[PDB]
Amino acid sequence: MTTTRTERNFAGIGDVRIVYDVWTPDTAPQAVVVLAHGLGEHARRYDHVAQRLGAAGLVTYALDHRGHGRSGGKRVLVRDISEYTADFDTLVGIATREYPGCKRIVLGHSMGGGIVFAYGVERPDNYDLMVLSAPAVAASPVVAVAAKLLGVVVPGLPVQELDFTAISRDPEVVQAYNTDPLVHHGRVPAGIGRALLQVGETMPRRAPALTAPLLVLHGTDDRLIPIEGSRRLVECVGSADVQLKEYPGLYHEVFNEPERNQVLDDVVAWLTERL
């Protein structure tokens, strides 16, 4: 339809400047969506997702995490999962004040899915629906201990060598990712590894705190985050209205796959069922 983007910013944890987009369609908003991107990317890789949501009368708030895209902070530097979740909580507060009376939908992809889950456990009544795209949620006990120790002393130390070529079966998506100057083109730092384990170590203990309906999306050929971790999440959450949509043969970024228009139409159908 016609969904215009406006750029704003707020002060995050440590007074780090956090830039976010607001996508507004030319119609009375049916609900608001607060979107959390994954590791190394930024909110401008979701223009087509925000535009698709605007077609359904949804307003989308999408922020760049600290150390990502337009936001402040050292690139992909993080020391605690609470840094990500507090800034997401601040954005949800912004959207709640701007649109009172609208249902609140929290959407997260990959690391953003782990962020949205950690926020959702802390504030289970601050949102109405939750949608997760291959969430980084289930990350031996000795390696978990050592990784969280390292990430708390040298959170900027490179550790894990991630395969960007597994993000999508679309060659244009893999190419656009790799030539984007705003995108992180390095190894996973130790701080991000610790934050991921922080949501992973506590998922089965704290998943019962969730109450709002939940939809999980995951391609079966995901080589970055295994689909079995999503099968285990939906069995642990306390929410009664839960379902996981598996896309056979799709890669990590189901919103960027050639079948993205089918994936996005499944998300809009799920939301319209509950709005």
Residue numbers in the entry: 1 to 139, 144 to 279
Q: What's the publication's text?
A:
Monoacylglycerol lipases (MGLs) resemble a major enzyme class involved in the hydrolysis of monoacylglycerols (MGs) to glycerol and FAs from intracellular and extracellular sources. Residues Ser110, His256 and Asp226 form the active site in the core domain of mtbMGL.
The cap-region has a Z like shape which resembles the specific architecture observed in other structurally characterized MGLs. The catalytic center is located in an approx. 18 Å deep cavity and can be reached from the outside in the observed open conformation via entry between the first and second stretch of the cap region (residues Ala138 to Arg173). The nature of the substrate-binding cavity is governed by predominantly hydrophobic side-chains located in the cap and core domains: Leu39, Ala136, Val137, Ala138, Ala139, Leu142, Val143, Val147, Ala148, Ala15, Leu154, Leu160, Val163, Phe168, Ile171, Val192, Ala194, Leu200, Leu201, Leu228 and Ile229, Pro230. Based on the structural similarities of hMGL and mtbMGL it can be hypothesized that conformational changes in mtbMGL are also realized by a rolling movement of cap helix 1 similar to the one observed in hMGL. The mtbMGL crystal structure indicates a monomeric form of the lipase as analyzed with the PISA server, which is in agreement with the size exclusion chromatography of mtbMGL in solution.
